[PDB]
Write a protein that binds this ligand. Structure first.
Ligand SMILES: *SCCC(=O)N1CCC(O)(c2ccc(Cl)c(C(F)(F)F)c2)CC1
Ligand SMILES: *SCCC(=O)N1CCC(O)(c2ccc(Cl)c(C(F)(F)F)c2)CC1
Ligand SMILES: [Cl-]
Ligand SMILES: [Cl-]
Ligand SMILES: [Mg+2]
Ligand SMILES: [Mg+2]
Ligand SMILES: [Mg+2]
Ligand SMILES: [Mg+2]
Lengths: 236, 10, 236, 10
């Protein structure tokens, strides 16, 4: 690995610099190098890893949607056939996206999840696993779409089970997990009623616990609660 | 319009 | 070259797809492959080449400025010394930026400029040469800053000489060349008075020729004229 | 504030 010769602390420092520079491919490579040092990650370091790869895969998802739309249009009655290039380039971007997802899933499997024993770290990583299987599901069409969806579901479910046992209903990790699992239900699993029920129950249980929070924690929780509300408004 | 997932928080 | 096996027309098609997807590194690689086929470029193809690399180097310039600012701050009385990492990462980005500039200058030298005989193509390429030497100048500090600046100046000057002989004063190629040369004077060459004089004369000579233009050409010319005005407002 | 150079036109 090209980061093998760099100090862990230097990789984290440069990840933060890359973030400031909006150089998210670099930021992800630095954080991959930091993970591969083999030590567990702090909460700030877990967040750097997530921010980096979410930005990288986010650009790929956006590009893939543009290209898939063009391809779908090209494949309709009355469309002048224009050769293999749209499909080829959509496939190129898709393969790069799947590669990023596989890299993240690899870091989680080797060995972030198995070393994560505290609820805050373990739920964070299992949510990430669900998220990157969900991004794989977004582009899956062959035999394995069903198995990819089930892998996402399983990871989210393990994360949910832990979060409900170990975290208050306002906890931001728990809230964002529920948000993303509800997105999985609506957008991937063809289960909009489950998505709505999860978002509603999550919102209501958090509302009832807000009185326990400081001003700063109240701000964190209500920001994510607003996203649940936004989706419920979209979905209903 | 696609559903909103958890955003980045720097 | 990894694009050597792809048809010229397929490379141009995919450059346009990459543009739609905002995948400008891909767009630049496709256009490099198209240039290396060895045929001259049409006006649309020249524009694709310019759009691609300007977006790539633009991201690098933005990142380099962020990192250089952090480095400059770190190097001031009362700044806790934080090791070599800021300098290292600024150097990494700087080297990547210089590489992109060298790639573009290489395509112009081998062999776009020497095959460009019409004024519209030759001025376009010489302006590009000035622009990418100017981007090199923005990060140059060693012995060669003077020679890089002179190379930019020389290319812009050859382009200006042709444009004034062969193009009307409202021509958008001529106007954007004058705009960028005025930026060179103000931002690189420490010649703000030359920058102002060039921007003013360019603006005034175009104003006097607008009556000759169609609605569509009038829109093109006045849009660039506005940029000259914006700079004059900034500079005075 | 830096001077404005010729922008991209798609
Ligand atoms: S420290 C391990 C957990 C972690 O790093 N997280 C969990 C969830 C947070 O997404 C979060 C915190 C606060 C807010 Cl306001 C938001 C959001 F509303 F989504 F912006 C997210 C950040 C990362
Ligand atoms: S076809 C060879 C010239 C070429 O491709 N150009 C020259 C200048 C143009 O920059 C241009 C044209 C019209 C407008 Cl409104 C602008 C600008 F105002 F800067 F947006 C630029 C485009 C590329
Ligand atoms: Cl391709
Ligand atoms: Cl570095
Ligand atoms: Mg037809
Ligand atoms: Mg595929
Ligand atoms: Mg001190
Ligand atoms: Mg250097």
């Amino acid at each position: 690995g090209a980061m093998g010769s760099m100090e862990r602390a230097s990789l984290i420092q440069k990840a933060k610099l890359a973030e400031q520079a909006e150089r998210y491919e670099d930021m992800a490579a630095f954080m991959k190098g930091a993970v591969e040092k083999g030590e567990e990650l702090s909460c700030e370091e877990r967040n750097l890893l997530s921010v980096a790869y979410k930005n990288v895969v986010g650009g790929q998802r956006a590009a893939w949607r543009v290209l898939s739309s063009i391809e779908q249009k090209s494949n309709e009655e009355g469309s002048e056939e224009k050769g293999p290039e749209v499909r080829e380039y959509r496939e190129k971007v898709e393969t790069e996206l799947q590669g990023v997802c596989d890299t993240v899933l690899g870091l989680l499997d080797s060995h972030l999840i198995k070393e994560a024993g505290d609820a805050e770290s373990r739920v964070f990583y299992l949510k990430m696993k669900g998220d990157y299987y969900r991004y794989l599901a977004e582009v899956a069409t062959g035999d394995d779409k069903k198995r990819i969806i089930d892998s996402a579901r399983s990871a989210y479910q393990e994360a949910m089970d832990i979060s409900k046992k170990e975290m208050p209903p306002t906890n931001p990790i728990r809230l964002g997990l529920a948000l993303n699992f509800s997105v999985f239900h609506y957008e991937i699993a063809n289960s909009p009623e489950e998505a709505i029920s999860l978002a509603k129950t999550t919102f209501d249980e958090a509302m009832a616990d807000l009185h326990t929070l400081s001003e700063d924690s109240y701000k964190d929780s209500t920001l994510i609660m607003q996203l649940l509300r936004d989706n419920l408004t979209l979905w209903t | 319009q696609r559903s909103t997932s958890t955003p980045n928080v720097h």
